[PDB]
Amino acid sequence: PAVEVRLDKWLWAARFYKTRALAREMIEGGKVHYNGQRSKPSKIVELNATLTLRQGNDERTVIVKAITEQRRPASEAALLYEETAESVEKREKMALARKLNALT
């Protein structure tokens, strides 16, 4: 089955975490959810799955659009998923509010 890529490898390939070991720690900390639930490092990624993950102190919800074992460049990896519009908005709004409480 050459259509089986682990969630920890995937998260690293997609550049969400610097190393697979870190991606594995985040998963085990419950900081990454797969279709709304705790997952595991060895979970095989499926196209269109919904992943919710912690980025520093940001939360992003992305939909898996491609699977690969290669970690490509910044702009290139970024193409293995599509962040949801609701996720981008939530992030923005929190960022804005941050900059607001700042100018006050």
The domain limits of the chain are 7-102
Does the CA dihedral 96-93-26-44 come out positive or negative?
negative
C-alpha span between 19 and 85 (Å, rounded): 27
DSSP label at 78?
G
Quickly tell me which residue has 């190393």 as its tokens. Answer: 19
Tokens of 49: 């799955």
Q: Determine how many CB atoms are found less than 10 A away from the CB of residue 81.
A: 19
Does CATH number 3.10.290.10 belong to domain 7-102? yes
Least Cα distance to 53 among 41, 77, 69, 36 occurs for: 36
C-alpha span between 5 and 47 (Å, rounded): 11
**Experimental method used, please?**
cryo-EM
Contact indicator for 65, 3 with CB cutoff of 8 Å: no
* Bridge partners, residue 37, by sequence: 34
